[PDB]
């Protein structure tokens, strides 16, 4: 039986006031808040949970201000609503920018996307985990109040004919919903099912936030510059709790009387391995892209996925029968190309302007710099020899360096040569590259040591910029940016085929997944794929996509069967599995092979 | 571009207007048919607006369907 009070946010800070008719107005001692919007609390923990829209983050801290920590730093835009589920110990938020309602543990771990399809603008958000339902206001073109089970399922639209609604607050005791309407300037209510819909107060100047407590509704008004109270049933008994307050963004009553009830998630997380989400009692959730195991309780990390970067983001996406997420990788500026190592699960990319090659885990916790200034263009990983092949735009060279950083050397150089795109084929011992010579571009092939050079194509080319290959079927794929098309041939050079020339605009990136060729289209802003079933769109309205890379499940036993896989086949520099099925050593351009046949 | 920071409406590309979102202005899309549009009861509600909508489209007009207002023609 402690004190009951109100919390509100005002952009610069979050303040705390009593329900008393004109009492004190203090601020919660938080640090580094710029544009606070969405509020919520946790009584058992005594923690507050807020959303900054300038910082683009969701943070938490105790009421005394200690232990301030960012709970969600990535993939946000405008997180305008957010609620705390006290029984499951999960955080729910709604980003009006990304148009997504999401969930994670209170601490931030195991983030998942609940609803994202056919969603306009989720603003306000109220949870009732005792009953398994969540409620949110939608803004956008045709505003409405939607309800869905707190796992994402059973999504329906409760209140269809409303303006922009904002104070979304469940009277847990009386089983009613109260909200403000910005376009009608009124406060309205309903029952849990959306029906029995009558307005409480209708002559309001400019209302915004709202919370109900006992027999009163509390709202904020910008024109009145006030925090007002009224009888939650009649709209009468209308007095002012706070005046002379400029802009009162959202507001909620802080008492243990609100965060009450019980579900199965409260008793040791319901035995789920990650997330426990309420339903009309519970069901175990996984992190985004993870999959629920046979036991209905444990999760499994994605095995086969798709990676695509924009200018300053690297996103992951699954190829399931059932959305893209942002990988948390700091310090991205102009991501030119990506690649992936399945052995150590490390993500390699090349940043422009900074002129470096970088690597990090899918969680971004291994951030290490491979090559530093001279500027690289495209990269391809020999996963077997554990080398990364790359092209230098500045010095027109094909440099090769190890995964640790140690330099191996240069395999191909010469003036008039201008190597740009590269793709390695260690299984057959060759590299296929794009040589952008002045006035006459080419697609070329050489052995992984720079010997055995030949031109594969010279006509019907203008700006070939991406290369990919299906080694199993023995085919090579390339996208010409200038000619707006995708072509494929035998690795030999034979059978040149146009795949797509119709609705392409700016193809700059492509990879083979299974029997599909995915390609980026920067200008048309979309990912597409083709059955090598017909052309299917994968993801439209993608910002500034720059490179794509399909990552398949690498089985260890299968990897080790490669001759170079174990200790590089004795070779000090370059291992070549050529011809019949035997390794042969070779060296970069500044070292000649020695007597031992292994070193130089 | 939709989402770009703007100061004037001419900073924004075709089909877009410059609208105040929170304590900054961003390029928002212009309202097409049937989409709800703001009708300010008092003058200065316009000024107070921190979540402003764009105006209606090329051949469209903002009128009524306590009801609400949509882009008609």
Domains of chain A in sequence order: 1-288 (2.120.10.30), 289-600 (2.120.10.30)
* For chain B, counts of helices (H) and of strands (E): 1, 4
Coil vs helix vs strand at A358:
strand
Beta bridge partners of B5: B26
Q: Which residue of A has its CA nearest to B45?
A: A206
Cβ-based contacts under 8 A for chains A and B: 49
Give all domains of chain B, ordered by start, each with its CATH number: 1-73 (2.10.80.10)
Whether A538 contacts A315, CB under 8 Å: no
Cβ contacts of A357-360, under 8 Å, gap ≥ 24: A357/A388, A357/A390, A359/A403, A360/A329
- Which residues of A sit within 8 Å Cβ distance of B? 11, 35, 37, 53-54, 77-78, 97, 141-143, 162-164, 182-186, 199, 202, 205-206, 222-223, 247
Shortest CA gap A233–chain B (Å): 19
**Whole-number Å distance between alpha carbons of B39 and A183:** 7
Q: Say whether A142 and B21 touch across the interface (CB within 8 A).
A: no
Of A73, A3, A5, A59, the closest CA to residue A31 belongs to A59
Last residue before each break in chain A (C–N > 2.5 Å): 280, 322, 373, 532
Half-sphere exposure of A64 (CA within 13 A, CB side): 4
Of A251, A224, A252, the closest CA to residue A239 belongs to A224
Whether A5 contacts A19, CB under 8 Å: yes
Taken as a whole, chain B contains a residue count of: 73
How many C-beta atoms lie closer than 10 Å to residue A540's C-beta? 11
Q: Say whether A223 and B44 touch across the interface (CB within 8 A).
A: yes
Q: What is the CA radius of gyration of chain A?
A: 29
Helix (H) or strand (E) holding B45: helix B45-48
**Whole-number Å distance between alpha carbons of B55 and A424:** 53
**Whole-number Å distance between alpha carbons of A339 and A415:** 28
What is the Cα A550 distance to its own chain's centre? 16
Of A526, A575, A546, the closest CA to residue A402 belongs to A575
A395's CB contacts (< 8 A; 6+ apart) are A374, A413
In terms of DSSP H, where are the helices of B1-73? 45-48
Helix (H) or strand (E) holding A242: strand A239-242
Shortest CA gap A186–chain B (Å): 9
All residues of chain B having their beta carbon less than 8 Å from the beta carbon of residue A159 are none
**Whole-number Å distance between alpha carbons of A31 and A37:** 15
Q: For A151, phi and psi rounded to 5 degrees?
A: -105, -15
Whether A510 contacts A468, CB under 8 Å: yes
All residues of chain B having their beta carbon less than 8 Å from the beta carbon of residue A247 are 50
A277's CB contacts (< 8 A; 6+ apart) are A88, A90, A103, A150, A151, A152, A265, A283, A284, A285
**Whole-number Å distance between alpha carbons of A510 and A342:** 19
C-alpha dihedral over A55, A60, A63, A65, to 10 degrees? -60
Helix (H) or strand (E) holding A379: strand A376-382
Q: Say whether B66 and A206 touch across the interface (CB within 8 A).
A: no
Q: Say whether B21 and A78 touch across the interface (CB within 8 A).
A: yes
All residues of chain B having their beta carbon less than 8 Å from the beta carbon of residue A35 are 22-23
For every residue of A503-526, DSSP letters joined together read S-S-EEEEEE-SSEEEEEETTTTE
**Whole-number Å distance between alpha carbons of A316 and A325:** 5
Of A283, A271, A245, the closest CA to residue A151 belongs to A283
Of A141, A164, A206, the CB nearest to B45: A206
| CB proximity B67 to A under 8 Å | yes
Whether A91 contacts A54, CB under 8 Å: no
Q: Say whether A206 and B39 touch across the interface (CB within 8 A).
A: no
Q: Which residue of A has its CA nearest to B46?
A: A206
* For chain A, counts of helices (H) and of strands (E): 1, 54
**What resolution in angstroms, rounded to 1 decimal?**
3.1
């Amino acid at each position: 039986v402690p004190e009951a009070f109100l919390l509100f946010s005002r952009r610069a800070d979050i303040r705390r006031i009593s329900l008393e008719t004109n009492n004190n107005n203090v601020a919660i001692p938080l640090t580094g808040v710029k544009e606070a919007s969405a509020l919520d609390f946790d009584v058992t923990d005594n923690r507050i949970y807020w959303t900054d829209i300038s910082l683009k983050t969701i943070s938490r801290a105790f009421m005394n201000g200690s232990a301030l920590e960012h709970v969600v730093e990535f993939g946000l835009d405008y997180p305008e609503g957010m609620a705390v589920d006290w029984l499951g110990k999960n955080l729910y938020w709604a980003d009006t920018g990304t148009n997504r309602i999401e969930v994670s543990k209170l601490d931030g771990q195991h983030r998942q996307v609940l609803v994202w399809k056919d969603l306009d603008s989720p603003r306000a958000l109220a949870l009732d985990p005792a009953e398994g339902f969540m409620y949110w206001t939608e803004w956008g073109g045709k505003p409405k109040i939607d309800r869905a089970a707190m796992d994402g399922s059973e999504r329906t639209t409760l209140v269809p004919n409303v303006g922009r609604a904002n104070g979304l607050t469940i009277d847990y005791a009386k089983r009613r919903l109260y909200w403000t309407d910005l376009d009608t300037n009124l406060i309205e209510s309903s029952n849990m099912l959306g029906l029995n819909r009558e307005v409480i107060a209708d002559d309001l100047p400019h209302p915004f936030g709202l919370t109900q407590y006992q027999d009163y509704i509390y709202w904020t008004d910008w024109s009145r510059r006030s925090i007002e109270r009224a009888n939650k049933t009649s709209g009468q008994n209308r007095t002012i709790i706070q005046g002379h307050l400029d802009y009162v963004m959202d507001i909620l009553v802080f008492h243990s009387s609100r965060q009450s009830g019980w579900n199965e998630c409260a008793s040791s997380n319901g035995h789920c391995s990650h997330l426990c989400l309420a339903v009309p009692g519970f069901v175990c959730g996984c992190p985004a892209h993870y999959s629920l195991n046979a036991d209905n309780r444990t999760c499994s990390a994605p095995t086969t996925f798709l990676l695509f970067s924009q200018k300053s983001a690297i996103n992951r996406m699954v190829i399931d029968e059932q959305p893209d997420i942002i990988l948390p990788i700091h310090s991205l500026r102009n991501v030119r190309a990506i690649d992936y190592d399945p052995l150590d699960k490390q993500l390699y990319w090349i940043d422009s302007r900074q002129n470096m090659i970088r690597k990090a885990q899918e969680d971004g916790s291994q951030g290490f710099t491979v090559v530093v200034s001279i500027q690289p263009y495209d990269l391809s990983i020999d996963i077997y020899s554990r080398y990364i092949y790359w092209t230098c735009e500045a010095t027109n060279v094909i440099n090769v360096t190890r995964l640790d950083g140690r330099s191996v050397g240069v395999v191909l150089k010469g003036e008039q040569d201008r190597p740009r795109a590269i793709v390695v084929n260690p299984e057959k011992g060759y590299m296929y590259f794009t040589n952008l010579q002045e006035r006459s571009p080419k697609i070329e092939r050489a052995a992984l040591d720079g010997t055995e050079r030949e031109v594969l194509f010279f006509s019907g080319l203008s700006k070939p910029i991406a290369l990919a290959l299906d080694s199993r079927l023995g085919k090579l794929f390339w996208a010409d940016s200038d000619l707006r098309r995708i072509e494929s041939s035998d690795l030999s050079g034979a059978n040149r085929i146009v795949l797509e020339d119709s609705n392409i605009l700016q193809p700059v990136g492509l990879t083979v997944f299974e029997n599909w060729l995915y390609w980026i289209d920067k200008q048309q802003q979309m990912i597409e794929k083709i059955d090598m079933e017909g052309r299917t769109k994968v993801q439209a309205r993608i910002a500034q996509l720059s490179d794509i890379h399909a990552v398949k499940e690498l089985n260890l036993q299968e990897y080790r069967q490669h001759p170079c896989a174990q200790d590089n086949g004795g070779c000090s520099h370059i291992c070549l599995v050529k011809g019949d099925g035997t390794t042969r050593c070779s060296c970069p351009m500044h070292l000649v092979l020695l007597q031992d046949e292994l070193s130089c | 571009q939709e989402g770009s920071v703007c100061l004037r409406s001419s900073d924004c590309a075709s089909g877009l207007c410059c609208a105040r979102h929170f304590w900054s202005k961003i390029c928002k899309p212009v309202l097409k048919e049937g989409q709800v549009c703001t009708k300010h009861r008092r003058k200065g509600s316009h000024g107070l607006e921190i979540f402003q909508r764009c105006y209606c489209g090329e051949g469209l007009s903002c009128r009524i369907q306590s009801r609400l207002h949509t882009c008609q023609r």
